């Protein structure tokens, strides 16, 4: 079993000062095996924090990230699953399904993770799985009407991934779970 934290669009410190305290309390160092970050940290402070949580941290370049050297996209394999990672500001219209499906095929991944919209998504489409963790800080963006903080945790064993979404609803954390199987 491999636990994979998925998060991004924190926008610390220009839009938000910190991760929500109850999210931070959930992330105990050593518990999680892999971290996949969609970008827009936007400073080294947040990268240092993720490195205190896990030994394998991946991050792609957001459109506000100070570190322009983060790769623009990444493919990581965890167990039986090949996973694609991109921030998503490059896709116009934002979140466009046909464009994300084209990315899925070109990366040749079972799961495609993107961000940028600050809207959590977790869904299957033509026998592939698509995840957007939303914004872990609830950072505003150009469009949306104030944002619920969220992050995702993938629980991977054999050919099954159980995707958990954590949301800060008012002042309390609530969860939802979705199962996916490699066909």
């Amino acid at each position: 079993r491999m636990l994979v934290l998925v998060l991004g669009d924190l926008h610390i410190p220009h839009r938000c000062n910190s991760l929500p305290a109850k999210f931070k309390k959930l992330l105990v160092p050593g518990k999680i095996q892999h971290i996949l970050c969609t970008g827009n940290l936007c400073t080294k402070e947040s990268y240092d924090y993720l490195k205190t949580l896990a030994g394998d941290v991946h991050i792609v370049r957001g459109d506000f990230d100070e570190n322009l050297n983060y790769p623009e996209q990444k493919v990581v394999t965890v167990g039986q699953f090949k996973i694609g990672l991109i921030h998503g500001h490059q896709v116009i219209p934002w979140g466009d399904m046909a464009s994300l499906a084209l990315l899925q095929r070109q990366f040749d991944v079972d799961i495609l993770i993107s961000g940028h919209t600050h809207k959590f998504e977790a869904f299957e489409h033509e026998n592939k799985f698509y995840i957007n963790p939303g914004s872990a800080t609830g950072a505003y963006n150009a469009l949306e009407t104030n944002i619920i903080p969220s992050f995702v945790l993938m629980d991977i064993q054999a050919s099954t991934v159980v995707t958990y979404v954590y949301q800060l609803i008012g002042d309390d954390v609530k969860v939802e779970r979705i199962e996916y199987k490699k066909p």
Binding site: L27, L153, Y164, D172, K174, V175, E176
Partner: peptide
């Protein structure tokens, strides 16, 4: 356990 986002119940989670 944590409460579910939608509905009334609770869900076990890995953290």
């Amino acid at each position: 356990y944590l409460p579910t986002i939608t509905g009334v119940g609770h869900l076990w989670h890995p953290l």
